[PDB]
Amino acid sequence: KTHVQLSLPVLQVRDVLVRGFGDSVEEVLSEARQHLKDGTCGLVEVEKGVLPQLEQPYVFIKRSDAAPHGHVMVELVAELEGIQYGRSGETLGVLVPHVGEIPVAYRKVLLRK
């Protein structure tokens, strides 16, 4: 399937134990997709002071369309030193590894895969 329904646990930035997916744009996009598939991917909602507490390169989910079954359609954009790889809509948040942190909420997305 071109799209996959996921429910991403929303984590508080200060709870996150593994603060990025790796060391290159290609690696973080690779690792993000693997974690999304394995159900081991969290989402941190981006506000003032959040991104400096996470490791670059960043992986964002961004809205790719205006929402089947409650699931917002999204795609992955990486960012490294202010340059983004990919072009998409509004940021829903930044993806991080999920290693058992308790979420505050869930974000239903339809991921273009």
C-alpha span between 69 and 36 (Å, rounded): 19
Q: What is the 3-state secondary structure (H, E, C) of 43-91?
A: EECCCCCCHHHCCCCEEEEEECCCCHHHCEEEEEEEEECCEEECCCCCE
Output the six-digit token pair for 91: 């940021």
Peptide linkage before 52 cis (omega within 30 of 0) = no
What is the residue range of 17's domain? 3-112
Q: Which of 12, 19, 22, 2 is nearest to 105 (CA)?
A: 12
Q: Phi first, then psi: what are they for 103, rounded to 5°?
A: -75, 165
**Quick one: 6 exposed, middle or buried, by C-beta within 10 A (0-12, 13-18, 19+)?**
buried
CATH of the domain at 49: 2.30.30
3-state secondary structure of 36: helix
CB atoms within 10 A of CB 59: 28
C-alpha span between 6 and 76 (Å, rounded): 14
> Resolution of this PDB entry, in A?
1.8
Structural domains counted in the chain: 1
Q: Of how many residues is the chain composed? A: 113
